[PDB]
Write a protein that binds this ligand. Structure first.
Ligand SMILES: *[C@@H]1O[C@H](CO)[C@@H](O)[C@H](O)[C@H]1NC(C)=O
Ligand SMILES: *[C@@H]1O[C@H](CO)[C@@H](O)[C@H](O)[C@H]1NC(C)=O
Ligand SMILES: *[C@@H]1O[C@H](CO)[C@@H](O)[C@H](O)[C@H]1NC(C)=O
Ligand SMILES: [Ca+2]
Ligand SMILES: [Ca+2]
Ligand SMILES: [Ca+2]
Ligand SMILES: [Ca+2]
Ligand SMILES: [Ca+2]
Ligand SMILES: [Ca+2]
Ligand SMILES: [Ca+2]
Ligand SMILES: [Ca+2]
Lengths: 596, 304, 98, 98, 304, 596
């Protein structure tokens, strides 16, 4: 019950002492006077404890036996080398306690060092060690609570060996700080109550007042006490308690729109985690299953120090989020109210009120009034690229998966004329939510019947099965420049590793039929390394697209995975920088530098 | 000294020894005092294991079960015979390399490690995984990195290992040396992270894994500061702390050299949101950040 | 199997490799060198003879080469910009006539 | 493993071998001769680079050599004096880049 | 036609078949006549095996046991369907080689065999062992030589094999060709020996080994001479004898081309010390030395 | 009993014949008249045999049934194609025989061809086929035996088709040869007895006497009869019946000294091997166990034709041989008499007498009155060779195994001086039965105390343990020409594969310290191929030495075994000819030709 300002009561002991001699007194603090204390020891297990004796009421420490050299040997603690370390325990209740009474209550440790020597010559001591220890502990105090006596400052080692003079103390260099000093028992005492929200730390400077014949001896030591916060502050708000929310093209789960804050002047310990102090619990009061099952709230709290008069303060936060991935044909508008309660505040008011301005809207999956009419400049190659196709507002989609298809308009005709619909294909890209168009066969284009085609593109949203289509026409006007001999077999371009060849190849991904050429100049490993690519638009872009994954001989640069040789940097996939005129083969790559 | 599991096998044979061991595992689970006496006399009660072998998890589990039920105060991990290894492992400075008094020492340690055929191997081993990108979200797999780093600082001879991590060089920041002295443990993976958690929370995190627990029990016990001695330490051994600190690397407590004018060190943590208990965090960090024994120890290796 | 093809070594800077790295780290490079004549067969003698005759205009098939069949452990290093790079299969461990 | 390092053949008289036999018998000789650049490692690139630099005065270690990893069956024949001779390991059966 | 061992497995299942087979193996060892009838009807009574397979020793043993107890007169080794193979194996001449009308044909056959990858292999195979010196007393191990020679003349296609052994070329002796035509089977090892034994003694020697016995039963049956026909043979097939004669090579009867103006052949033997039975030896040798069917057959291949 | 001049009685048969019609008669020969014959058939198993009928006494063949087309089908013999072949059997005893009587006696085969045609037109035949068959058999006769009628010469196929005229025969172109012709039964008959030892073959020329209206038709055929020898000739001798034998230095087993012959005018069939005719059995009549257990006889017989009036005659042979390998301390002289008996001669005398002149002498295993005092020209190398040592008459030993040893004369002296007896060794060669002397260590010769040594050579015959020794002295006078730096490590010489190096090496087997050099010039594979050898005396010699077998780096040329590469000939071991400047390494050899 009665808390202990310190957990360390340390002193030194020596040989040649007598029973019935005071050694130390410990003090306890009570919030109200009806609790009267009664001191006592514990740790009755060991035998050396039978010598120490204590007074049930006053709280001072005595002894019941003298010291002898034989006693030094019987006390063993780890190593045999002096000094020897011992440890004891103590508790204080308001009524006569039993053996079992103190293993339940919180106690404190007493660490006393044992040396096998007698009292020293007291004129050989130094000034620095006269009135204060080597290292010191900083006690603590609690805000908004009754005051009392704090600590003892007499050292019984230096006070019992040379008792020819009297000593006192004093608080020094203080700009009216609420502390004091008694003279009857020379105890450091607190003047009156305090509020942590006003002052957080107390730098001090204490002195020893000694009476000496040569001159009055004053020695200065320093320390500072700490403050303990109790939740005596309810939260408030800056600004408003409302936020605007919009849901148009981002319907994926785990997305966030809103931002609301709150402030509590108290402090929120993170450890231990089984606490409740200044931790805000938020409750909703909406019963709609759709909204509740679909929407999510987020909680995240830190602490700040720069907006409370340079005092450590807490700041909660709250933001909106979705739960699951939503449909495209819904529309609702409402207000969400989310409450908060600081359960550790024993006051009439411990809450605030938030409000969200939610606007859920649907989206139309339709094409534009305009059509898509692509074309091909010249006689092309397999796995090329002509045009993209997307519904209106295609970039801004999120959480929307769409499949694209196409079909012929002339259903059934002679097979010879049916072949002319083998010179086109399609691809699908969930990243950009669009559709890429690439040729498939080239032996079809020779005929003049293929020169014009017509397709009906189909767009099918997965979740709702909605549909939308338009008319597509594709026209090739590139006459064959004396290249009939070549059958459907075209070499790659990633392996020319030179300008001269790469310009005169005809290979995969060649719209014009010639693969592109790059020339990166720099001193060392640069992000611009000379290569040969079919289309520079998306071959070294970084990652690969749906087309790049069809064949391994089409820009391995961004989609390759196997070991690479030479001077290079690389992320997960594909080379970011390689020292010089880099190149590749079917899966294996070698970035080097050509001295010639 | 002797291991624990060997003593375990020993006691599992004697009828009285194992019989009272079972009686005890039953007593502590909820005469029994008379059984305490027999246990103390057995070599197990004083059993302590060390490094260099390949069976420790079981020893550590055994001793933790024995004494946790009946961590920094009383450490098992190191017997009191390590001073014999300590003094001999204070010699490496003379054994390191003839060349000295250059503009940088970290680079010289790296040169020396890329010429021996054990440090080189293990260094590249706990390097490459820490630099391996396995997804566009992640940058590397830390489990592999920490484990490899650990099994390097366990085996490779001290002469070549400590040098790279403790190399001294002229004061300041942005001196080529300090860059490498900081980048020895590749902090981007094994050090950094998105958020800084309170040290105390990380202290509890360490307190569960069976390795970090012991590598931490070694720290306080060795490097404890005392100003009375000229050395600044308690147990008057400069290399004992030198080992204990390096025994933490890889574990949940992966420190590095902060950006401070002096030689300070902190784990990836800070005393934020600690509320009333800013004193405990401050003591932890101060013992870990600004101390005499550790500065003296790290400086000793510098004067080579 | 020839004993004249042996493992030699030379101390170099990483920069002498001309791979583009900027670092002051160093290394031991190891390599195979020496004659393999005691392991040749009738095949090689015929090749030698038709080469000396010039009767094969341009085709020049190879006789026994002394080459590594196993490589040393991986190496790592830090460049001047404090980025790490790693090199694999850079150095020989044991040599043989093949 | 390189596919440019292929197997070719040429029809010769035994006497073109210049091994000293006197016979009118004939044979099919087989051999491998092509590039194996697609199988090279960092080792070979370093070698190439130090050769082009001339920084190794005389040492000239070998890069990858398309050599035959197995030989054809034995052959027998009769010379002009009606004495038989036999030749072993004279012709390739299947080569690789080693 | 079907093999014998297959018919053996077949008859070993039927109760009556195997029961009477045992009754019989008992009867011939010393009603039984009624059991003869059942055996004749079984496919086993008319079973005949041939070449190209790898299980013959057992077939030959089976049939020899069946009929020897109850050799040239009635031969098993070849069914009456071989003429279909005979005529097709008379074509090889056109399939051999375009070049012709040179000063030597044996050399051309050798050239053709050192260009194919089966004849070449097997030729060097039954060559090298026959030229292997294994002691200062011996000159070669004949067992290996004969067996290799045999398994060559069993497999390698006739187009390339028969040519080297039957190559024709201008008359005389000391013409380069005849030297090779004689030295095809390396007689110094597979032909010669220190003493010439009487042929009849060698006839009995052959009559025990299970292979030479059949390869000889084929000879008389095929090449038997008759002057009434223009061909000069009995069964009007030039390649049947061509096969039967070549089927002896390797066995105890290893003939070669003697030094005679015409085309004569004799095994390594002579009708010396034969006493009264100079007639039997003379008939044997004459049938083997000077005949029309064999000269016509060997000449047919010559006109290509 | 009664032997058959022929084993083949062949005729042709046709359809349309009658029972009770003669077909053939067979004749048997009897040595004495009291044996009267009685003919009969056998092979009663088949059914077709029930038709044929025979006369018990006269010996002619008849039929009991006619021919019908149905009978042709029932007769099956292998293939179904005409002609069909049948076979019968016949025996003749002097008394009525049973079914069982003829499976025991020797019989003859009758091979008759069946054709399903009738009698032919008789004016369409040819002259050549008129009186004689296509192929004929040569009958045989026995020397010194009673004569009789031999063969029948009427062909019953031709006689029935044109029964118009009569035919006879005659022996033509004969220089008074003992044959004749009958006219009653037109049978070929022998005039009287004959002696094979006079005439061996009878070339004949027989004619057909036909009576024809156009002109008398004479047709000539030829044949020749053979003679059967009976042992009516005892052996004789040319020269003497004695031989000189000597046993001095060849005492190994299986060695032969003597040569004795004999002659028998008879012939000795080799086959069948279960016979006894003119095979000579030799018996000894000596009882001495030593001689009989130690000596061996050899038998080997051929036949000759050029010393009996161009008649085939037999010649036995006999030669002396040893049984086991004999001692060196024996001496005996005696006469061996070995008898022979021609057991197939039923005459009073069928033997001869031989005699051997054996002289067994001992051998002295002793050295010459002279000693062996070798020397070394210069400073030598390991595994060299200085001198051979052998007892008197050492080349001519055979069957004598000898071991050679050596020992020091100064038994015990200071160890430093004891070392000087480490610069010598010994070897042993059972081929030449001598002992080779080679140095072992070279670090010993550097002291002046080693300059003189003395050994006592020991020769110990294995079987008798005899001993013999002399005094050996070895002196080295080759001063060190500034070569102390070299420790005991010397390279081989078989691998220099060149003149220049080989002359300036110091290696194994170098007496002078330099290995020898060879230069074989020729066009191709010659027995003289240039190499480098330590000592040319025995390095390319042939059978490797006792020294050659110590190290593999000492002339592998003669004792190597592993595969060799290039142009070469080789016997069992070592290269006989290699195309050019051949060479070797440690076990592997490469004979090539150096174009430079
Ligand atoms: C937010 O409101 C608080 C109310 O106490 C005020 O002190 C603070 O200055 C405000 N923040 C601003 C104005 O940025
Ligand atoms: C539901 O409505 C009741 C009032 O009817 C309210 O108290 C409650 O907070 C609402 N939400 C939930 C989750 O109960
Ligand atoms: C050997 O003696 C026989 C005695 O019949 C004689 O005929 C023969 O000529 C002799 N051999 C000679 C003289 O060479
Ligand atoms: Ca307050
Ligand atoms: Ca508060
Ligand atoms: Ca609060
Ligand atoms: Ca891409
Ligand atoms: Ca006579
Ligand atoms: Ca006679
Ligand atoms: Ca006789
Ligand atoms: Ca020799």
């Amino acid at each position: 019950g009665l808390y202990f300002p310190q957990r360390l009561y340390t002193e030194n002991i020596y040989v040649g002492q007598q029973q019935g001699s005071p050694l130390l007194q410990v003090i306890s603090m009570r919030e109200f006077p009806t609790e009267r204390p009664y001191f006592f020891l514990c740790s009755h297990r060991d035998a050396f404890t039978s010598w120490f004796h204590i007074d049930e009421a006053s709280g001072v420490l005595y002894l019941n036996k003298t010291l002898e050299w034989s006693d030094f040997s019987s006390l063993r603690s780890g190593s045999v080398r002096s000094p020897k370390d011992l440890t004891l325990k103590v508790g204080v209740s308001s009524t006569p306690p039993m053996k079992v009474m103190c293993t339940i209550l919180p106690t404190v440790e007493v660490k006393l060092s044992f040396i096998n020597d007698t009292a020293p010559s007291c004129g050989q001591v130094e000034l620095s060690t006269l009135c204060f220890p080597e290292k010191i502990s900083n006690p603590h105090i609690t805000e908004n609570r009754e005051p009392g006596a704090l600590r003892q400052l007499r050292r019984f080692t230096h006070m019992s060996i040379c008792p020819n003079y009297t000593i006192s103390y004093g608080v020094v260099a203080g700009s009216s700080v609420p502390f004091a000093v008694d003279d009857s028992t020379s105890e450091l005492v607190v003047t009156a109550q305090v509020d942590r929200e006003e002052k957080e730390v107390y730098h001090l400077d204490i002195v020893c007042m000694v009476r000496t014949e040569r001159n009055l001896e004053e020695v200065f030591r320093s320390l500072h006490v700490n403050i303990y916060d109790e939740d005596d502050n309810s939260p408030y708000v800056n600004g408003t308690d409302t936020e605007d929310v919009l849901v148009e093209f981002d319907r994926s789960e785990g997305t966030v729109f809103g931002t609301l804050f709150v402030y509590d002047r108290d402090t929120t310990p993170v450890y231990p985690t089984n606490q409740v102090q200044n931790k805000l619990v938020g409750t909703l009061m909406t019963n709609d299953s759709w909204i509740k099952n679909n929407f999510a709230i987020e909680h995240k709290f830190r602490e700040e120090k720069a907006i409370f008069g340079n005092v450590r303060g807490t700041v909660h936060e709250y933001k909106l989020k979705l739960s699951q991935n939503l449909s495209v044909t819904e529309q609702r508008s409402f207000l969400l109210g989310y409450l908060v309660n600081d359960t550790t505040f024993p006051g009439p008011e411990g809450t605030v009120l938030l409000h969200f301005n939610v606007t859920v809207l649907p989206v139309p999956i339709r094409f534009s009034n305009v059509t898509y009419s692509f074309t091909v400049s010249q006689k092309a190659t397999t796995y090329s690229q002509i045009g993209k196709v997307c519904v209106e507002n295609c970039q801004k989609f999120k959480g929307i998966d769409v499949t694209y298809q196409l079909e012929i308009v002339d259903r059934n005709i002679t097979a010879e004329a049916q072949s002319c619909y083998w010179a086109v294909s399609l691809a699908q890209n969930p990243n950009d939510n669009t559709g890429v168009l690439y040729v498939n066969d080239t032996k079809v284009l020779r005929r003049p019947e293929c020169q014009e085609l017509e397709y009906v593109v189909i767009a099918q949203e997965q979740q709702n099965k909605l549909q939308a289509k338009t008319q597509l026409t594709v026209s090739f006007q590139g006459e064959a420049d004396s290249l009939r001999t070549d059958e459907p077999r075209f070499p790659a371009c990633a392996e020319k590793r030179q300008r001269g060849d790469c310009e005169a190849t005809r290979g995969l991904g060649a719209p014009t039929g010639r693969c592109q050429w790059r020339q990166g100049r720099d001193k060392g490993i640069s992000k611009r390394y000379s290569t040969c690519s079919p289309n520079l638009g998306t071959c070294p872009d970084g990652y690969c697209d749906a087309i790049e994954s069809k064949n391994i001989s089409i820009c391995p640069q961004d989609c390759s995975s196997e070991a690479i040789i030479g001077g290079y940097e690389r992320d997960l996939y594909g080379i970011k920088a390689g020292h010089g005129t880099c190149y590749c083969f079917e899966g294996k790559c070698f970035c080097e530098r050509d001295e010639p | 000294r002797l291991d624990c599991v060997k003593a375990n096998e020993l006691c599992l044979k004697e009828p009285g020894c194992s019989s009272k061991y079972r009686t005890m595992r039953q007593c502590v689970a909820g005469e029994c005092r008379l059984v305490l006496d027999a246990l103390k006399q057995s070599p197990l009660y004083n059993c302590r294991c060390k490094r260099g072998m390949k069976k420790e998890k079981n020893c550590l589990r055994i001793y933790w079960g024995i004494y946790q039920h009946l961590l920094l105060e009383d450490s098992p991990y190191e017997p009191v015979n390590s001073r014999l290894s300590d003094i001999f492992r204070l010699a490496p400075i003379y054994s390191g390399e003839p060349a000295l008094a250059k503009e940088n020492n970290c680079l010289n340690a790296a040169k020396a490690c890329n010429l021996n055929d054990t440090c080189k191997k293990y260094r590249s081993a706990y390097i490459s995984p820490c630099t391996s990108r396995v997804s566009t979200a992640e940058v590397c797999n830390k489990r592999k990195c920490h484990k490899a780093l650990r099994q390097f600082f366990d085996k490779v001879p001290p002469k070549h290992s400590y040098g790279m991590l403790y190399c001294s060089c002229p004061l300041g920041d942005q001196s080529a040396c300090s860059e490498r002295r900081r980048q020895t443990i590749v902090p981007a993976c094994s050090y950094e992270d998105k958020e800084r958690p309170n040290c105390l929370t990380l202290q509890v995190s360490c307190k569960t894994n069976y390795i970090c627990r012991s590598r931490l029990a070694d720290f306080f016990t060795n490097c404890q500061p005392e100003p009375l001695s000229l050395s600044g330490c308690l147990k008057e051994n400069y290399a004992d702390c030198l080992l204990s600190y390096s025994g933490l690397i890889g574990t949940v407590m992966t420190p590095n050299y902060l950006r401070s004018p002096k030689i300070s060190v902190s784990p990836f943590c800070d005393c934020s949101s600690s509320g009333n208990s800013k004193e405990e965090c401050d003591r932890f960090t101060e013992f870990f950040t600004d101390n005499a024994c550790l500065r003296n120890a790290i400086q000793a290796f510098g004067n080579g | 199997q020839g004993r004249g093809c042996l493992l030699k070594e030379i101390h170099l800077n990483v920069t002498d490799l001309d791979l583009g790295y900027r670092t002051k780290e160093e290394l031991i490079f190891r390599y195979c060198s020496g004659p393999c004549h005691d392991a040749e067969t009738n095949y090689d003698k015929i090749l030698n003879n038709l080469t000396h005759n010039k009767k094969l205009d341009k085709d020049t098939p190879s006789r026994t080469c002394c080459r590594p069949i196993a490589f040393d452990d991986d190496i790592s290093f830090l460049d001047d910009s404090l980025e790490y790079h790693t090199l694999k299969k850079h150095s020989a461990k044991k040599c043989a006539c093949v």
